[PDB]
Design an enzyme around this catalytic site. Structure first.
Site, PDB file in Angstrom:
ATOM      1  N   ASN A  46       5.725   2.780   7.854  1.00  0.00           N
ATOM      2  CA  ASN A  46       4.310   2.786   8.273  1.00  0.00           C
ATOM      3  C   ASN A  46       3.366   2.513   7.137  1.00  0.00           C
ATOM      4  O   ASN A  46       3.707   2.729   6.003  1.00  0.00           O
ATOM      5  CB  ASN A  46       3.989   4.095   8.920  1.00  0.00           C
ATOM      6  CG  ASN A  46       4.896   4.342  10.115  1.00  0.00           C
ATOM      7  OD1 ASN A  46       4.776   3.661  11.124  1.00  0.00           O
ATOM      8  ND2 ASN A  46       5.844   5.243   9.974  1.00  0.00           N
ATOM      9  N   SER A  50       5.012   6.754   5.355  1.00  0.00           N
ATOM     10  CA  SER A  50       6.074   7.461   6.023  1.00  0.00           C
ATOM     11  C   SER A  50       6.933   6.401   6.719  1.00  0.00           C
ATOM     12  O   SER A  50       6.565   5.217   6.768  1.00  0.00           O
ATOM     13  CB  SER A  50       5.482   8.408   7.085  1.00  0.00           C
ATOM     14  OG  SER A  50       4.793   7.670   8.119  1.00  0.00           O
TER      15      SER A  50
END
Ligand SMILES: [Cl-]
Ligand SMILES: [Pt+2]
Ligand SMILES: [Pt+2]
Ligand SMILES: [Pt+2]
Ligand SMILES: [Pt+2]
Ligand SMILES: [Pt+2]
Ligand SMILES: [Pt+2]
Length: 129
Positions: A46, A50
């Site tokens: 992402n 993360s």
């Protein structure tokens, strides 16, 4: 592993997802389809740094430890790598903690955008369960 539709339905059902927090099986299968395309080895990095892991694209910011998500939690108390196994057990138990957390299956954006309010029954159509 890349599951077939009914194979995954049955494995989800064996592991206690059918009607878990009131979400019928078809919801879980639909989520997996659009999150991972039924591939346990799916990962997706992402913008925030993360990573989402596994058949249900469980995210390292809150739910698992990948060692490279600064400031994150590990609420399922597992390494993110465990969510990649052909055995869906770690993903199932974590998804249970996630779906109990307050937003239900809305925590899966792909569920919200592609499954919610649709005929999710179609995802278990023709499966021996
Ligand atoms: Cl997630
Ligand atoms: Pt198989
Ligand atoms: Pt199993
Ligand atoms: Pt189980
Ligand atoms: Pt497809
Ligand atoms: Pt658990
Ligand atoms: Pt049955």
């Amino acid at each position: 592993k890349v599951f077939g539709r009914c194979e995954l339905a049955a494995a989800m059902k064996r592991h206690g997802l059918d009607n878990y927090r009131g979400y019928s099986l078809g919801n879980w299968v639909c989520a997996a389809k659009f999150e991972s395309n039924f591939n346990t080895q799916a990962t997706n990095r992402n913008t925030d740094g993360s990573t989402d892991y596994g058949i249900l694209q469980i995210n390292s910011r809150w739910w698992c430890n990948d060692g490279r998500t600064p400031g994150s939690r590990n609420l399922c108390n597992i390494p993110c790598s465990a969510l990649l196994s052909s055995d869906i057990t770690a993903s199932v138990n974590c998804a249970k903690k996630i779906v109990s957390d307050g937003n239900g299956m809305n925590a899966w954006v792909a569920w919200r955008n592609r499954c919610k309010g649709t005929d999710v029954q179609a995802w278990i159509r023709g499966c021996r369960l």
